[PDB]
Design a protein around this ligand. Structure first.
Ligand SMILES: NC(=O)c1ccccc1
Ligand SMILES: NC(=O)c1ccccc1
Lengths: 508, 508
């Protein structure tokens, strides 16, 4: 039977809604609530007899500090493919916010550490059926609300290019492992740039596909309308190969529209880009907070594409700066409402839920809230203000502005094939000391998402490709295009790779 | 600029998440939260300069007790059509939970009374462009969480067949007006049976279309996955005519899938039903709480269809009883989470929001929570328990069971064209005294949704058609069919009408 609430809880519930119970109310509600909970009892029973996922027996190990030099691994594994395919012989690291049945996961947070899922996320299942070997779970920022790599409760991920500098984030671990050569590919998540940012910082390729293309099923949600799963690879070709395996509706993710279909990211990957219009978004350069050397390197990189027949011109998209603030509201109000109060999955959406995870997270986060990262706490405090005092109006206003933001980019996309700008306005900085300032902490973890975040809310596919080195550190060029035109975005990235030439390895 | 929270609020927010602020935290957060709110300021500005709906000048009047004999009207109007069409010369009443720009609305609740929307719901706009004249707003149950007609803060709606008995609900007012002949049609909402129930009680036709067919845009939400808007009419033909005008994607309702398309509900409305298989769902009859006279009348009505070439057989669908409990969890946890904590619209879904309404509702419901109906309070208390203590797990479990419920009905629908059972297990009962028992109140307002509610969660189109009189009071036969096969559901309803013959008017 489902647990019933006690009188103290009933009173707390009533006070939550501003309801005042008299003496007779406090006496009757219990029995009534108990009657209502009768349906919950039935759901509990039906769920136990019909929707309880099977058990799993897979092995894993906590690597020793020696076999985990960058602190990029949470746990290691060797899960064999179920069929041979285009990934046979390759290894893949899975971001810790993504479930792998029978394997522990914590999503870089103390509020989740200790959870062992019963289901494999859809992308995990597709990877295995393509011949890949899942090599383990890669550490991710505390509940992923961080653009750097110092919020993981298990410690900071070191960049393989400079073990003193950040690996980025929130998929810091994934990129590090890929850059360091520990795995061939990695599955990363992107809500404000978590796939593109660490890739840029670690000198690897990161693709946040068109929203809804890759099923999110099985990954810990943050805010439903901006959740993205995607590939982090060493090369554009591999990124396209991974996408061909993971893309496509799975019938369990409400984010995916009925019309979603996997495109062809390989057939024309190497086709010439002669005649393609490349738009350099002005608002993507010269931010108050930035390193000009970085912007110029990427700017030069963008223009060099003329060397292969591309017409390159600058274009103004004022809404690019507006989109950031619209994203921030959606991520702040939405994140606190869903990720926290809704315990990850939230409610009011059709699809496959993870009630085991929801329960686990619910208890742990209230007993370890103080351990939550400073950025998550910021989201919590201000979002709660947005949800209650503000009545959710700001979230509503932001939602009503999204179409305008989308249209602003699509208009530019009628004049250009793809839009380009620096992925990040600066190279990986040194890791802060575990004595950091709350204010510094929040600015150093959220000040590099200005160009990436906008595309999370509008949903356009956005790709980060290494564009060169600045003071020995990797910088990235971000190529963004039309919804579901991931193929063209990848083609341009590929074409740029050929022109740019082989990009150095942190081991080189 | 967006209102900032004070230290007391910041502390309350922190306590809400189990976060404990020290002395320095209480000192720093303010400035940080203020910085975060900077994005809200920008959203506020952009929204004011670009997404603020125009002003409106329409007239309305509060009818006198004399011109509002059944207490079915909230306010009356005479909004002329914008174009001539299939509804020219007809009047339509709009349920009070549905916005009509420039006109007051309260959704039968004290927590909303006083609100005047700036946008017209999509169905309102479509009705006007089809030649209809909007005659006013029809009273609906307190926040619609009631299957009867005694929860409206403005008083109970009297059934035109017996002004001492309930008109049903939550669209009680709409059905009453239609039955009484005050209007030709009405737009009603259905979350647990609000369109079908009052129609059945008042002897009129009520159609809860396939989920997602009719845009919900502009109507006050309860729980996103079970929200439905539909027509309430005097005849099946009119119901089909209305559906042809309101059905179809509007690009603003996240509930509507990309593949949704309006069907043809008129071409074959009068075609012969010779050979159609009609399945009498056993679990839809003989409930512990019910009036056998009612079940037999409907049972006999269902069999009479053989008189026109239909093959009629009984079929077992055990999941019909399970679906009720699955619905209850989704409506209880989901309703408290979205309708209350989310102030109607909630979050984490793409679409057109009503931030003005969200703000208004947010302030009013905390100052008038004690005025909320007993059923809403039940939802509030137990749902809050589900959201917090239960961690939302029950909601998740219920969601994971929905497909099985859907499949159970679809399997029956492979053996039969449509499924039939009584809309309600009993005729309209006498109105309770404003001295009612909380327990009685909750059972008398929620004990008649056993057959209707299941279809709200699975989404199948479900139609209630008058099947006869029992002790002088109307009883209804509910015809339910496949997703988006509203046309066949209507055809059967039509065919039954012809056979049954003209149904008496409460004025006859
Ligand atoms: N990289 C991300 O997805 C991110 C999300 C939220 C805040 C910062 C970064
Ligand atoms: N008729 C309805 O939609 C309803 C919803 C909730 C509870 C009772 C009835």
């Amino acid at each position: 039977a489902t647990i019933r609430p006690d009188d103290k809880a009933i009173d707390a519930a009533a006070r939550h809604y501003g309801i005042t119970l008299d003496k007779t109310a406090r006496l009757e509600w219990p029995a009534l609530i108990d009657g209502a909970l009768g349906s919950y009892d039935v759901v509990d029973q039906l769920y136990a007899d019909e929707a309880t996922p099977p058990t799993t027996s897979r092995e894993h190990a906590v690597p020793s500090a020696s076999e985990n030099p960058l602190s990029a691994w949470y746990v290691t594994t060797s899960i064999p493919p179920t069929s041979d395919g285009v990934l046979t012989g390759r290894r893949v690291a899975i971001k810790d916010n993504v479930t792998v049945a029978g394997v522990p996961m914590m999503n870089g947070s103390r509020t989740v550490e200790g959870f062992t899922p019963s289901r494999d996320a859809t992308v995990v299942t597709r990877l295995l059926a393509a011949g890949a070997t899942v090599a383990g779970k890669a550490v991710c920022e505390d509940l992923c609300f961080s653009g750097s790599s110092f919020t993981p409760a298990s410690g900071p991920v070191r960049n393989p290019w400079d073990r003193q500098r950040e690996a980025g984030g929130s998929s810091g671990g994934s990129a590090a492992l890929v850059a360091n050569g520990d795995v061939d590919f990695a599955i990363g998540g992107d809500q404000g740039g978590a796939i593109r940012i660490p890739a840029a910082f670690c000198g690897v390729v990161g693709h946040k596909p068109t929203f809804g293309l890759v099923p999110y099923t099985g990954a810990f949600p943050i805010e439903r309308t901006i959740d993205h799963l995607g590939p982090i690879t060493r090369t554009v070709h591999d990124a396209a190969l991974m996408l061909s395996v993971i893309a496509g509706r799975d019938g369990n993710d409400p984010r995916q529209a009925d019309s979603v279909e996997a495109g062809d990211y390989l057939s024309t990957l190497d086709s010439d880009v002669d005649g393609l219009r490349i738009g350099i978004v002005r608002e993507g350069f010269g931010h108050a907070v930035s390193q000009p050397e970085v912007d110029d390197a990427v700017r030069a990189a963008a223009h060099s594409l003329t060397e292969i027949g591309c017409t390159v011109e600058e274009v103004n998209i004022p809404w690019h700066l507006h989109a950031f603030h619209i994203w921030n509201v959606i991520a702040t109000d939405g994140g606190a409402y869903q990720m926290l109060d809704g315990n990850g999955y939230g409610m009011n959406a059709e699809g496959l839920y993870d009630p085991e995870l929801m329960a686990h997270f619910a208890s742990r986060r209230i007993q370890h809230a103080d351990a939550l990262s400073e950025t998550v706490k910021l989201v919590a405090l201000t979002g709660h203000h947005g949800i209650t005092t503000l009545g959710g109006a700001s979230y509503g206003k932001a939602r009503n502005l999204v179409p305008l933001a989308r249209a602003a980019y699509d208009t530019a996309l009628r004049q250009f094939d793809v839009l380009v700008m620096p992925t990040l306005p600066y190279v990986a900085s040194e890791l802060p000391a575990k004595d950091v300032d709350r204010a510094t902490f929040i600015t150093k973890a959220l000040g590099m998402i200005a160009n990436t975040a906008p595309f999370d809310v509008t949903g356009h596919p956005s790709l980060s490709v290494p564009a060169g080195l600045v003071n020995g550190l990797p910088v990235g060029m971000m190529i963004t295009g039309r919804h579901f035109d991931d193929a063209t975005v990848l083609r341009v990235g590929r074409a740029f790779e050929k022109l740019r030439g082989a990009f150095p390895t942190p081991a080189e």
